[PDB]
């Protein structure tokens, strides 16, 4: 060794290519590993040289040392990790490749590495390199990152800072090389669990890109994509150009894999939230029928049934094709099972959702007869009363069930036939006393159904007998706009 | 339609050897 090391002239660049090849021999590589100065000579050199054949080689050696435990440790303790990182700057693709593969080694096995990479800027650099074109290279890099980001939030915030979400989202959108799409999907998912990073990932096109890969053959990917999309699915109610994603999901509902059927269902429930296009997209690719079919095929499995009903709940209201969707549910035999889900062993969350869906289906007049003829009413009341005591005297506040069941009855009360049942289960004395409730949301619905019930003379009498003019009128100046309006309508309807 | 057009929908909140060596020959 001796001579080699020393030199500060045209002399040492010659010395350079000279050691890269002893690194190849086993007891030679092993040899230099047991030297303190042999390593720190490559290091100082590799960074402070400017001959593109001197670097390529010094880097090359380190890569060869990085396979063994005393190989790695000697590298690390030789302050090489600061160096290896500046080499991530080198234009020479032969060095980029030496460095990023090396570091990967370092992070995977060596102790105190992740810190050193971070502290030296590693992250902000590794994120800059995602514009490179070599897939074999990216997939390694997007791993180093996943390594540095796992269970470390400072790091995930710095990859947000750098424009990572864009970079990675571009990859998902450009390449098809699995090992890459995979390691890159893993990172996305890891950042998918951050307050901030979520919207970023979304706005960059995260949703639309992940879903090019749902019908992929590799399952170790379609997973990641599904899960990841599920996380983000609540940030993503704002986006456009989903036509693709929606239509795909609506087809994975057919998947004879329970754990993919739930994710398909979960994710839709969210992307159908509030966004009036997403609803229409979903309806036209036959989504109503797909959901119903999925609900029947799921039975007592409430991880599937809960989401799917929320989704049907969403699609049955507040968009141009909702009347379509309310009929669709009737025509594809959804009514009988929707109702049967108000029965045990359904749990309240699910029962909460299902009443909401029934509230909506009831707006469609065709669904008045059909819903009546499945005893949706007698059952809604059952729950209403059970619930209106669990309060007077969880998993969900019973107030929500009381409001839910009276709203649903409100809507159903529109049909004169229904109106007759409703009254004849001795409900009226119970509607009137809901007025006196601390919750306005409850007073609003209560007064609503009364208003409808009270379009019949004999009922207006019945409703007046309960002394309903006492609190309708003290609500007549209620803080709540909806509360106060209905009060007028019932009072107006008993005087005619 | 419905009284309640301004209503919101509730959202559920949810929560390489082969290529490394291959790359140092495309380096050599």
By the CB < 8 Å criterion, does B27 face chain A? Answer: yes
Question: Contact A270/A310 with Cβ under 8 angstroms?
Answer: no
The alpha-carbon gap from B26 to the nearest alpha carbon of chain A, in Å, equals 8
Distance of alpha carbon A301 from alpha carbon A318, whole angstroms: 28
What are the structure tokens assigned to A163, written together? 């424009």
Which of A385, A407, A400 is CA-nearest to residue A482? A407
Question: Contact A16/A4 with Cβ under 8 angstroms?
Answer: no
Residues in chain A: 496
* Structural element, H or E, at residue A230: helix A219-232
By the CB < 8 Å criterion, does B12 face chain A? Answer: yes
Residues in chain B: 28
Indicate the fold that domain A1-496 takes in CATH: 1.25.10
End-to-end CA distance of chain A, in Å? 111
Question: What are the chain B neighbours of A109 within 8 Å (beta carbons)?
Answer: none
What are the structure tokens assigned to A491, written together? 């009072």
Distance of alpha carbon A357 from alpha carbon A476, whole angstroms: 30
DSSP H stretches of helix in A416-468 = 416-423, 428-434, 440-453, 457-465
A320 CB neighbour count, 10 Å cutoff: 11
Q: What is the largest CA-CA distance in chain B?
A: 73
In chain B, the residue whose alpha carbon lies closest to the alpha carbon of A193 is B15
Name, in order, each residue with C-beta under 8 angstroms of A488's C-beta and a sequence gap of 6 or more: A476
The alpha-carbon gap from B20 to the nearest alpha carbon of chain A, in Å, equals 6
Which of A182, A133, A190, A135 is CA-nearest to residue A164? A190
Question: Contact A291/A271 with Cβ under 8 angstroms?
Answer: no
Q: Are A318 and B7 in contact (CB < 8 Å)?
A: yes
Distance of alpha carbon A12 from alpha carbon A59, whole angstroms: 16
Tracing tokens 């507040």 back to the chain, one arrives at A318
Q: Residue A92: is it exposed, middle or buried by C-beta count within 10 angstroms (0-12/13-18/19+)? A: middle
Half-sphere exposure (CA, 13 Å, Cβ side) for A167? 25
Decide: helix, strand or coil at residue A81. Answer: helix
Percentages helix, strand, coil for chain B, rounded to the nearest 5? 30, 0, 70
Q: Residue A479: is it exposed, middle or buried by C-beta count within 10 angstroms (0-12/13-18/19+)? A: exposed
In chain A, the residue whose alpha carbon lies closest to the alpha carbon of B12 is A270
What are the structure tokens assigned to A232, written together? 């983000």
Smallest Cβ–Cβ distance between B27 and the set A94, A230, A313 belongs to A94
Buried b (16+ CB within 10 A) or exposed e, A239-266: beebeebbbbbbbbbebeeeebbbbbbb
- CA A328 to chain centroid: 28
Q: Rounded to whole angstroms, what are the CA distances from A143 to A91, A117, A178?
A: 21, 14, 13
Q: Residue A35: is it exposed, middle or buried by C-beta count within 10 angstroms (0-12/13-18/19+)? A: middle
The alpha-carbon gap from A120 to the nearest alpha carbon of chain B, in Å, equals 23
Question: Contact A192/B13 with Cβ under 8 angstroms?
Answer: no
Half-sphere exposure (CA, 13 Å, Cβ side) for A367? 30
Distance of alpha carbon A84 from alpha carbon A96, whole angstroms: 9
Distance of alpha carbon A16 from alpha carbon A45, whole angstroms: 9
Q: What DSSP letter does each residue of A85-138 carry, written as one string? A: HHTTT-S-HHHHHHHHHHHHHHHHH-TTHHHHHHHTTHHHHHHHGGG---HHHH
In chain A, the residue whose alpha carbon lies closest to the alpha carbon of B3 is A482
Buried b (16+ CB within 10 A) or exposed e, A152-186: eeebbbbbbebebbbbbbbbbeeeeebbbbbbbbb
Q: Domain residues of chain A, as ranges? A: 1-496
Distance of alpha carbon A376 from alpha carbon A340, whole angstroms: 9
Between the CA atoms of A106, A109, A115 and A117, what dihedral angle is there, to the nearest 10 degrees? 20
Q: Are A313 and B9 in contact (CB < 8 Å)?
A: yes
DSSP state for residue A394 in the 8-state scheme: -
The alpha-carbon gap from B11 to the nearest alpha carbon of chain A, in Å, equals 5
Q: Rounded to whole angstroms, what are the CA distances from A383 to A6, A209, A342, A428, A448?
A: 88, 44, 9, 16, 19
What are the structure tokens assigned to A268, written together? 């839709």
DSSP state for residue A178 in the 8-state scheme: H
Q: What DSSP letter does each residue of A294-349 carry, written as one string? A: HHHTTTT-HHHHHHHHHHHHHHTSSSTTHHHHHHHHHHTT-HHHHHHTTSTT--HH
DSSP H stretches of helix in A17-89 = 26-33, 36-48, 54-65, 69-76, 80-86
Q: Are B14 and A101 in contact (CB < 8 Å)?
A: no
Between the CA atoms of A339, B11, A150 and A90, what dihedral angle is there, to the nearest 10 degrees? 130
Percentages helix, strand, coil for chain A, rounded to the nearest 5? 70, 0, 30
Decide: helix, strand or coil at residue A438. Answer: coil
Distance of alpha carbon A29 from alpha carbon A35, whole angstroms: 10
The alpha-carbon gap from B22 to the nearest alpha carbon of chain A, in Å, equals 8
Q: Can you give the resolution of this entry in Å?
A: 2.9
Decide: helix, strand or coil at residue A395. Answer: coil
Distance of alpha carbon A271 from alpha carbon B7, whole angstroms: 16
Q: Residue A55: is it exposed, middle or buried by C-beta count within 10 angstroms (0-12/13-18/19+)? A: buried
Question: What are the chain B neighbours of A313 within 8 Å (beta carbons)?
Answer: 9
Smallest Cβ–Cβ distance between B15 and the set A56, A97, A193 belongs to A193
In chain B, the residue whose alpha carbon lies closest to the alpha carbon of A134 is B23
Distance of alpha carbon A82 from alpha carbon A184, whole angstroms: 25
Smallest Cβ–Cβ distance between B15 and the set A134, A183, A231 belongs to A231
Q: Residue A458: is it exposed, middle or buried by C-beta count within 10 angstroms (0-12/13-18/19+)? A: exposed
Q: Residue A481: is it exposed, middle or buried by C-beta count within 10 angstroms (0-12/13-18/19+)? A: exposed
Q: What is the CA radius of gyration of chain B?
A: 28
Distance of alpha carbon A158 from alpha carbon A329, whole angstroms: 48
Which of A434, A460, A430, A456 is CA-nearest to residue A445? A434
Question: Contact A101/A140 with Cβ under 8 angstroms?
Answer: yes
End-to-end CA distance of chain B, in Å? 71
Name, in order, each residue with C-beta under 8 angstroms of A340's C-beta and a sequence gap of 6 or more: none
């Amino acid at each position: 060794t001796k001579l080699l090391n020393d030199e500060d002239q045209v002399v040492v660049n010659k010395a350079a290519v000279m050691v890269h090849q002893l690194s190849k021999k086993e007891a030679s590589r092993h040899a230099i590993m047991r030297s303190p100065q042999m390593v720190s000579a490559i290091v100082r050199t590799m960074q402070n040289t400017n001959d593109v054949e001197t670097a390529r080689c010094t880097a090359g050696t380190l890569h060869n040392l990085s396979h063994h435990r005393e190989g790695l440790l000697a590298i690390f303790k030789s302050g090489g990790i600061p160096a290896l990182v500046k080499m991530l700057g080198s234009p020479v693709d032969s060095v980029l490749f030496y460095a990023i593969t090396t570091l990967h080694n370092l992070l995977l096995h060596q102790e105190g590495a992740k810190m050193a990479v971070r502290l030296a800027g590693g992250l902000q650099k590794m994120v800059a390199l995602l514009n490179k074109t070599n897939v074999k290279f990216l997939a390694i890099t997007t791993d180093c990152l996943q390594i540095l980001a796992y269970g470390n939030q400072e790091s995930k915030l710095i990859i947000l800072a750098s424009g990572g979400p864009q970079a990675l989202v571009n990859i998902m959108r450009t390449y098809t090389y699995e090992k890459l799409l995979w390691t890159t999907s893993r990172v996305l998912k890891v950042l998918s669990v951050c307050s901030s990073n979520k919207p970023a990932i979304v706005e960059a096109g995260g949703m639309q890109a992940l879903g090019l890969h749902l019908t992929d053959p590799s399952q170790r990917l379609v997973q990641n994509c599904l899960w990841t999309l599920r996380n983000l699915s609540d940030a993503a109610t704002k986006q456009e150009g989903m036509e693709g994603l929606l239509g795909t999901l609506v087809q994975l509902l057919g998947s004879d894999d329970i754990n993919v059927v739930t994710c398909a269902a979960g994710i839709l429930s969210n992307l159908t939230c509030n966004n009036y296009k997403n609803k229409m997209m979903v309806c036209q690719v036959g989504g109503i029928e797909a959901l119903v079919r999925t609900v029947l095929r799921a039975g007592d499995r409430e991880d599937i049934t809960e989401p799917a009903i929320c989704a049907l709940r969403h699609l049955t209201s507040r968009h141009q094709e909702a009347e379509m969707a309310q009929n669709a549910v009737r025509l594809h035999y959804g009514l009988p099972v929707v109702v049967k889900l108000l029965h045990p062993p359904s749990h309240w969350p699910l029962i909460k959702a299902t009443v909401g869906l029934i509230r909506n289906l009831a707006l469609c007049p065709a669904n008045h007869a059909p819903l009546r003829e499945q005893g949706a009413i007698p059952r809604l009341v059952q729950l209403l009363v059970r619930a209106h005591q669990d309060t007077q005297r969880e998993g969900v506040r019973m107030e929500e069930i009381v409001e839910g069941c009276t709203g649903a009855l409100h809507i159903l009360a529109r049909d004169v036939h229904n109106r007759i049942v409703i009254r004849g289960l001795n409900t009226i004395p119970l509607f009137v006393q809901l007025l006196y409730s601390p919750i306005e949301n409850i007073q609003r619905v209560a007064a609503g159904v009364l208003c409808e019930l009270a379009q019949d003379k004999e009922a207006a009498e019945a409703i007046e007998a309960e002394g309903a003019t006492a609190p309708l009128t003290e609500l007549l100046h209620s803080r709540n706009e909806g509360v106060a309006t209905y009060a007028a309508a019932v009072l107006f309807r008993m005087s005619e | 339609g419905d009284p309640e057009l301004c209503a919101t929908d509730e959202m559920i909140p949810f929560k390489l050897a082969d290529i490394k060596s291959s790359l140092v020959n495309e380096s050599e």
